[PDB]
Design a protein around this ligand. Structure first.
Ligand SMILES: [Ca+2]
Length: 119
């Protein structure tokens, strides 16, 4: 679920408030269209697409599904007790968190005008 995703981000990117990823480019947070603005935005586009795939699983709701994961000593892991839905969502989140940690963050791409620039 989103709370756990937030914690993953805190796990992998301690040097930034998670809010910094909540409104970035065309895909980071609200927004699911247009040409990705940069590498970080591409991370979010992949995450968006990943959730769309997971929602094809019967009764699978990515924003709300609680999964089993662990964040310790610099390592993010999705546990083996997850059902198909939980495993899929946990992996979408994990890969995105890892993606965020390696992508440059450009302040000029925060809170851009989605209606005008993401067509
Ligand atoms: Ca999005």
């Amino acid at each position: 679920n989103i709370y756990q995703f937030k914690n993953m981000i805190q796990c992998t990117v301690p040097s930034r408030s998670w809010w910094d990823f909540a409104d970035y480019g065309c895909y980071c947070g609200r927004g699911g269209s247009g040409t990705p603005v940069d590498d970080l935005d591409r991370c979010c586009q992949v995450h968006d697409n990943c959730y769309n795939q997971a929602q094809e699983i019967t009764g699978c709701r990515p924003k709300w599904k609680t999964y089993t994961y662990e964040c310790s000593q610099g390592t993010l892991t999705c546990k083996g007790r997850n059902n198909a839905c939980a495993a899929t969502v946990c992996d979408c989140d994990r890969l995105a968190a890892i993606c965020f940690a390696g992508a440059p963050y450009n302040d000029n791409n925060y809170n851009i005008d989605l209606k005008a620039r993401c067509q």
